[PDB]
Amino acid sequence: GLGYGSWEIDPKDLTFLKELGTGQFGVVKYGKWRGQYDVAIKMIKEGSMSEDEFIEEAKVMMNLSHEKLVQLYGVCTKQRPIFIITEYMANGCLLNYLREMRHRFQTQQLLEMCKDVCEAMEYLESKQFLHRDLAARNCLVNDQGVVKVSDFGLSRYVLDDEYTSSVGSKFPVRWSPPEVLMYSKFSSKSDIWAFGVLMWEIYSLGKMPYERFTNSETAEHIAQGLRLYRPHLASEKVYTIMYSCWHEKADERPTFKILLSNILDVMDEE
Ligand SMILES: CNC(=O)[C@H]1Cc2c([nH]c3ccccc23)CN1C(=O)[C@@H](Cc1cccc(C)c1)NC(=O)c1ccc2[nH]ncc2c1
Ligand SMILES: [Cl-]
Ligand code: NA
């Protein structure tokens, strides 16, 4: 079934409609399950994933469930290529959503997007689960405007070394703390850093972090003490929150639980 019963979904119960997304991992199609329920069908391009390891871990990820986490309904592994059946989010990736000027966002909406993501990440943290590539491109927005965290943990199965090596051309350098870029030291605190950058993306309406700097320059300068400027739409109290994610010393950065409380405090003042 869809999130109930077998986690192996029968692809004969799926209809494959419009494409929602495409990249070096595969292609994402909108679909219906038993002609009633909307789904996003993420089909894994052969040659891109450690498929055995990925299927083993998908079974465990079936147990992750939270309102602000993109729901995994199941998988289709008895064919080539394999599919992941996931929650359909009608408004697409958060990065493009932020860049659409027609939305004319209020700052109250931007803070709520931060709350949404933070609640999802507090959940993952309580499960000792790392996202490992948190960023606006990896969040989705549903038909009601709710943001949910997507593709959490997926980078563990990507074979392309340009994307998993901290020196690779596809690595999330601009979302990584210095100890990741220097020593490959991953932890909850490197998710925390990325979340700070994600808040900066949100309040910048989707601008690229450190736009005037190359990947190599960014890595060098953030280690020296460069930090992202306060976006014009971010109040001092909002900037204080995202800035706290970027302390040089990882164990000085907050937890997602503390970040969420800070975000609620700012919301509660309206
Ligand atoms: C490298 N990415 C990729 O290759 C493809 C396919 C795919 C993903 N993740 C996968 C996992 C397994 C197989 C294929 C993929 C992720 N992916 C997407 O375009 C993402 C946006 C995105 C993120 C990072 C980097 C880039 C370049 C694009 N969008 C969506 O995923 C999406 C967009 C609209 C939606 N509406 N509802 C749900 C939904 C989902
Ligand atoms: Cl410090
Ligand atoms: Na810049």
Swiss-Prot record:
Domain Protein kinase intervals? 14-267
What tissues express this gene product? Predominantly expressed in B-lymphocytes.
Q: How is it modified after translation?
A: Following B-cell receptor (BCR) engagement, translocates to the plasma membrane where it gets phosphorylated at Tyr-163 by LYN and SYK.
- In this chain, dasatinib is annotated as bound at T86, E87, Y88, M89
Q: Where in the cell is it found?
A: Cytoplasm; Cell membrane; Nucleus; Membrane raft
| Modification Phosphotyrosine, positions | Y163, Y229
Positions with a binding annotation for ATP: L20, G21, T22, G23, Q24, F25, G26, V27, V28, K42
Q: Which residues form the active site?
A: D133
Annotated consequence of substituting R132Q: In XLA; severe; prevents activation due to absence of contact between the catalytic loop and the regulatory phosphorylated residue
Question: Changing D133H: what effect?
Answer: In XLA; severe
Q: Which domain of life is it from?
A: Eukaryota
Which residues pair up as cystines? Answer: none
PTM annotation (Phosphoserine): residues: S216, S235
* Motif, CAV1-binding: chain positions: 193-200
The UniProt record gives the binding positions of clofedanol as T86, E87, Y88, M89, L154
Effect of changing E179K: reported as: In XLA; severe
Self-association state and partner proteins as the record states: Part of a complex composed of EEIG1, TNFRSF11A/RANK, PLCG2, GAB2, TEC and BTK; complex formation increases in the presence of TNFSF11/RANKL. Binds GTF2I through the PH domain. Interacts with SH3BP5 via the SH3 domain. Interacts with IBTK via its PH domain. Interacts with ARID3A, CAV1, FASLG, PIN1, TLR8 and TLR9. Interacts with MPL/TPOR.
Give the UniProt family note.
Answer: Belongs to the protein kinase superfamily. Tyr protein kinase family. TEC subfamily.
Per the entry's comment, what about the domains?
Answer: The PH domain mediates the binding to inositol polyphosphate and phosphoinositides, leading to its targeting to the plasma membrane. It is extended in the BTK kinase family by a region designated the TH (Tec homology) domain, which consists of about 80 residues preceding the SH3 domain.
Briefly state the protein's biological role: Non-receptor tyrosine kinase indispensable for B lymphocyte development, differentiation and signaling. Binding of antigen to the B-cell antigen receptor (BCR) triggers signaling that ultimately leads to B-cell activation. After BCR engagement and activation at the plasma membrane, phosphorylates PLCG2 at several sites, igniting the downstream signaling pathway through calcium mobilization, followed by activation of the protein kinase C (PKC) family members. PLCG2 phosphorylation is performed in close cooperation with the adapter protein B-cell linker protein BLNK.
The record names the disease as: X-linked agammaglobulinemia: Humoral immunodeficiency disease which results in developmental defects in the maturation pathway of B-cells. Affected boys have normal levels of pre-B-cells in their bone marrow but virtually no circulating mature B-lymphocytes. This results in a lack of immunoglobulins of all classes and leads to recurrent bacterial infections like otitis, conjunctivitis, dermatitis, sinusitis in the first few years of life, or even some patients present overwhelming sepsis or meningitis, resulting in death in a few hours.
Return the protein name: Tyrosine-protein kinase BTK
Identify the gene encoding this protein: BTK
